[PDB]
């Protein structure tokens, strides 16, 4: 296999539309019922409706009642859901996930899902500041690198191009006025830096920018 | 609309050990009750449906019960593949509706934060803003709080909070804490102190830095 081929990100405006898909492979598509799942980044669960291929039966969530819009084709084995009116209200990943053969409400497959960004930024490569303790701040040192206001996510960012990963945090983004930041530090032994050169390496595709910034002791 | 009360809303286990999780419909949904498994950055995947029929692969040492409102699922030796989150939808009628999870954690030794912080970079500086960092890792348990004071008093807006969830390889938590401010602003200011309460320490762990020294 069962397979559900979703559509790409999207990245749109406020009080814009967007039309996701859900390609089916490996059962026959009309003898399933096709759902679809709203979740926002570390928050719950939540049904939109439902489409049955067979008969093009809907049924909907009253509190999506005119915003989403489930259709599907059944030449071509694929569903859709379309969002309408957006707000940054519907950034979340959308899933479209087969309802069970016998138990049609009971949810067995589900998509890998479809991230949906409403907003109104405009591409903006990140500012990346190193982060090197104060003068002031024993066996091990902890480093940072800040990538801030960027848009859109995401950002990748590696240490000595990959080479340190073991004591790597990177920090989930957060959204502040339109723009995303995070963080990332780094933990190694104090023997090797400053003695030893610590480089973060951060990459953010969308404006297709590549930096790298050294981690230097403090002039202080 | 039917209300799903999953409950507990976190959950803390061993390898071995027998968890159960409940959950009740605000209304008699008979044996139209699901369960779910929803690893950390991954899909959910169907355990149990019509309250107690595992579904495709799923363990034996998992069961589901009840029948009405009442509902609940039972791990019997938690393995270490069990931990993630845990949803129940009921699948009676529209609209569908799911708990509000659980999220079942493993248990590891205490271990207090290495707390570090730094002052704003002098490249953020010559860009005019000012941000202080103070990364807070590889603590547990979870539970943690962290307050900036500036000059002796504690400082709240400006202050953005991230939080990794628990880590593959070691069970512990780690979290990042920002301070933005205007260069103006921070120059105002002379000292700048990151201060977290955990259980590990009836006082907090305090780190910090003079900005004129």
């Known amino acids: 296999q069962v397979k559900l081929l979703e559509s790409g990100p999207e990245l749109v405006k406020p009080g814009a539309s967007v039309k996701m898909s859900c390609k089916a492979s490996?059962?026959?598509?009309?003898?399933?019922?096709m759902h679809w799942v709203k979740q926002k980044p570390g928050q719950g669960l939540e049904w939109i409706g439902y489409?049955?291929?067979?008969?093009?039966?809907?049924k909907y969530n009253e509190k999506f009642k005119g915003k989403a819009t489930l259709t599907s084709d059944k030449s071509s084995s694929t569903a859709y859901m379309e969002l309408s009116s957006l707000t940054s209200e519907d950034s979340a990943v959308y899933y479209c996930?087969?309802?069970?053969?016998?138990?049609?409400?009971?949810?067995?497959?589900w998509g890998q899902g479809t991230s949906v960004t409403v907003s109104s930024a405009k591409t903006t490569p990140p500012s990346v500041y190193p982060l090197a303790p104060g003068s002031a701040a024993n066996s091990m040192v902890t480093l940072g690198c800040l990538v801030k206001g960027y848009f859109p996510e995401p950002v990748t960012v590696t240490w000595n191009s990959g080479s340190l990963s073991s004591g790597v945090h990177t920090f989930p983004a957060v959204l502040q006025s339109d723009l995303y930041t995070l963080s990332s530090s780094v933990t190694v032994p104090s023997s090797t830096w400053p003695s030893e050169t610590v480089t973060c390496n951060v990459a953010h595709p969308a404006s297709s920018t590549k930096v790298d910034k050294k981690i230097v002791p403090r002039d202080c | 609309e039917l209300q799903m009360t999953q409950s507990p809303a976190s959950l803390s286990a061993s390898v071995g050990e027998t968890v159960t999780i409940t959950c009740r419909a605000s209304?008699?949904?008979?044996?139209?009750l699901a369960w779910y498994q929803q690893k950390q950055g991954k899909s959910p995947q169907l355990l149990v449906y019509?309250?107690?029929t595992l579904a495709e692969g799923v363990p034996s040492r998992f069961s589901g019960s009840g029948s009405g409102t009442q509902f609940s699922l039972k791990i019997n030796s938690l393995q270490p593949e069990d931990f993630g989150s845990y949803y129940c939808?009921?699948?009676?009628?529209?609209?569908?509706?799911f708990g509000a999870g659980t999220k079942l954690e493993l248990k590891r030794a205490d271990a207090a934060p290495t707390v570090s912080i730094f002052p704003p970079s002098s490249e953020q500086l010559t860009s005019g803003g000012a941000s202080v960092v103070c990364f807070l890792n590889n603590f547990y348990p979870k539970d943690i709080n962290v307050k900036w004071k500036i000059d002796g008093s504690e400082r709240q807006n400006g202050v953005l909070n991230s939080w990794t969830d628990q880590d593959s390889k070691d069970s512990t938590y780690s979290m990042s804490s920002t301070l933005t401010l205007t260069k103006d602003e921070y120059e105002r200011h002379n000292s700048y102190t990151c201060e977290a309460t955990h259980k590990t320490s009836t006082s907090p762990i305090v780190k910090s830095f003079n900005r004129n020294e």
């Open positions: 019509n309250a107690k």
């Open positions: 209304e008699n949904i008979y044996s139209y």
């Open positions: 996930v087969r309802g069970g053969y016998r138990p049609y409400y009971a949810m067995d497959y």
């Open positions: 939808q009921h699948h009676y009628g529209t609209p569908l509706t």
């Open positions: 490996g059962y026959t598509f009309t003898s399933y019922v």
């Open positions: 489409i049955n291929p067979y008969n093009d039966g809907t």
